Design a protein around this motif. Structure first.
Motif, PDB file in Angstrom:
ATOM      1  N   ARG A 151     -62.344 -22.245  40.914  1.00  0.00           N
ATOM      2  CA  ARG A 151     -61.460 -22.609  41.966  1.00  0.00           C
ATOM      3  C   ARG A 151     -62.017 -23.797  42.825  1.00  0.00           C
ATOM      4  O   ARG A 151     -61.387 -24.897  43.465  1.00  0.00           O
ATOM      5  N   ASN A 152     -63.541 -23.798  42.811  1.00  0.00           N
ATOM      6  CA  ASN A 152     -64.318 -24.779  43.545  1.00  0.00           C
ATOM      7  C   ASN A 152     -63.999 -26.154  42.753  1.00  0.00           C
ATOM      8  O   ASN A 152     -63.855 -27.227  43.314  1.00  0.00           O
ATOM      9  N   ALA A 153     -64.094 -26.254  41.269  1.00  0.00           N
ATOM     10  CA  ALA A 153     -63.894 -27.254  40.491  1.00  0.00           C
ATOM     11  C   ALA A 153     -62.534 -27.814  40.888  1.00  0.00           C
ATOM     12  O   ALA A 153     -62.101 -29.058  41.035  1.00  0.00           O
ATOM     13  N   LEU A 199     -64.504 -16.891  38.896  1.00  0.00           N
ATOM     14  CA  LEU A 199     -63.057 -17.506  39.434  1.00  0.00           C
ATOM     15  C   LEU A 199     -63.502 -18.394  40.346  1.00  0.00           C
ATOM     16  O   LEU A 199     -62.715 -19.382  40.724  1.00  0.00           O
ATOM     17  N   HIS A 200     -64.402 -17.871  41.441  1.00  0.00           N
ATOM     18  CA  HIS A 200     -64.658 -19.011  42.432  1.00  0.00           C
ATOM     19  C   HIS A 200     -65.253 -20.400  42.240  1.00  0.00           C
ATOM     20  O   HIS A 200     -64.679 -21.258  42.741  1.00  0.00           O
ATOM     21  N   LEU A 201     -66.162 -20.250  41.073  1.00  0.00           N
ATOM     22  CA  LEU A 201     -66.626 -21.505  40.614  1.00  0.00           C
ATOM     23  C   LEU A 201     -65.513 -22.333  39.909  1.00  0.00           C
ATOM     24  O   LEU A 201     -65.281 -23.688  40.247  1.00  0.00           O
ATOM     25  N   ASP A 203     -60.405 -27.160  43.282  1.00  0.00           N
ATOM     26  CA  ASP A 203     -60.037 -27.653  44.765  1.00  0.00           C
ATOM     27  C   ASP A 203     -61.031 -28.806  45.058  1.00  0.00           C
ATOM     28  O   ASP A 203     -60.488 -29.929  45.681  1.00  0.00           O
ATOM     29  N   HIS A 204     -62.177 -28.668  45.027  1.00  0.00           N
ATOM     30  CA  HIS A 204     -63.292 -29.577  45.594  1.00  0.00           C
ATOM     31  C   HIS A 204     -63.672 -30.744  44.557  1.00  0.00           C
ATOM     32  O   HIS A 204     -63.889 -31.709  44.797  1.00  0.00           O
ATOM     33  N   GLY A 205     -63.720 -30.307  43.234  1.00  0.00           N
ATOM     34  CA  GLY A 205     -63.662 -31.147  42.162  1.00  0.00           C
ATOM     35  C   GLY A 205     -63.005 -32.386  41.798  1.00  0.00           C
ATOM     36  O   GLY A 205     -63.125 -33.589  42.032  1.00  0.00           O
TER      37      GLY A 205
HETATM   38 MN   LIG Z   1     -65.675 -22.966  47.368  1.00  0.00          MN
END
Ligand SMILES: [Mn+2]
Ligand SMILES: Nc1ncnc2c1ncn2[C@@H]1O[C@H](COP(=O)(O)OP(=O)(O)NP(=O)(O)O)[C@@H](O)[C@H]1O
Ligand SMILES: Nc1ncnc2c1ncn2[C@@H]1O[C@H](COP(=O)(O)OP(=O)(O)NP(=O)(O)O)[C@@H](O)[C@H]1O
Ligand SMILES: [Mn+2]
Lengths: 180, 179
Positions: free
Chosen positions: B56-58, B52-54, B60-62
């Motif tokens: 969310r990273n995508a 789930l964190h990966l 959010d930050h991707g």
């Molecule tokens: Mn992150």
């Protein structure tokens, strides 16, 4: 229409690719390209290549039958594959059409019954459109490319894709892209 | 007493991805592949949070906002792909996005700030030495970060690797043993 470019920037690479795919799969195909001067956003031109190539390969693989088969079936010996572009209102329409064997809808029906998606009674009530749409359900077909991938790329462009086919008559895939 | 389809892990993601993208106002076409892929049942509960964190990273930050996707000449809608498969004696799980990619310059800046590297060594770092900083425990602010993902993956006796190209995107690959 800010960054328009003729769709020929993506089309011209297909004649050679089609010819080699035909030789590899032992199919005889007459490839026709129409509307290569149709202008569309450059982002699309650069992204629609993978998709189109896949639809063209599908036509050559599953669509057009070997010459000896077309002959035995009573069809023109050589197969025809048409890649075209045109304008329909504020939409650019690209089509891939073959006069092959057509999509085997019973095959789809049987696979859907197999995955428990529908039972027999229900399968007898489905329309061709409902049947053909199973081809877009992710994981439905056996392989990543596929119709799943073509729909996703096309839609990420805010585009739309549809299919239509008639047994032994052929198949036509239609992609609608928006005017920018 | 062994395998179960990875769907027990993947099932809740579509809804969380849709909700997440909606909150950060991002257009995201979420694609899940190979949910029938099987893995050891004792991996289910432990690989969930990290995955789930990966994602969310995508999100959010991707994936960049529409106007930013448009200025870069990219498909308006971002693509987030989660996939699982069997290749060899392990299960392969990939999380890839066609976003702006990991800001390597920013990572190097954080590395220096955390005493993980001297500035005199930053200029020649390879892309792999840079990205690997994310795996150093205590790198991320707080909770779970890439450092916790790598730790959880290690505790499952598997491995993880990162790949990223500016303005092109990021792909995270996790390989877990089957038996
Ligand atoms: Mn992150
Ligand atoms: N032009 C066509 N003519 C006839 N049948 C077609 C055509 N295009 C697709 N099909 C059929 O539709 C099913 C799915 O196409 P698709 O999703 O592209 O999968 P695939 O060709 O089976 N395998 P992959 O190579 O992984 O994409 C095919 O397997 C054929 O049975
Ligand atoms: N898919 C991605 N695309 C672009 N940048 C990414 C991606 N994943 C991670 N990053 C960047 O890598 C740095 C670290 O990610 P990570 O270790 O997950 O920490 P985090 O962002 O601080 N934690 P949190 O605030 O808890 O979500 C981030 O701060 C981003 O700048
Ligand atoms: Mn195919």
């Amino acid at each position: 229409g800010s960054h328009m470019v003729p769709i020929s920037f993506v089309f011209n690479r297909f004649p050679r690719m089609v010819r080699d795919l035909a030789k590899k799969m032992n199919k005889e195909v007459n490839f026709i390209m129409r509307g290569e001067d149709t202008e569309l956003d450059r982002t699309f031109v650069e992204e629609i290549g993978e998709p189109l190539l896949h639809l063209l390969r599908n036509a050559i693989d599953h669509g057009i039958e070997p010459k000896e088969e077309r002959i035995a079936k009573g069809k023109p010996p050589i197969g025809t594959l048409i890649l075209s572009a045109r304008h329909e209102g504020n939409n650019v329409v690209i089509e891939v059409e073959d006069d092959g064997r057509g999509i085997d809808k019973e095959k789809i029906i049987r696979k859907a019954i197999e995955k428990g998606l529908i039972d027999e009674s229900k399968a007898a009530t489905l329309s061709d459109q409902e049947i053909l749409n199973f081809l877009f359900v992710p994981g439905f077909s056996t392989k990543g490319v596929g119709m799943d991938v073509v729909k996703n790329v096309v839609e990420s462009l805010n585009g739309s894709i549809s299919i239509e086919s008639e047994k032994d008559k052929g198949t036509k895939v239609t992609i609608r892209l928006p005017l920018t």
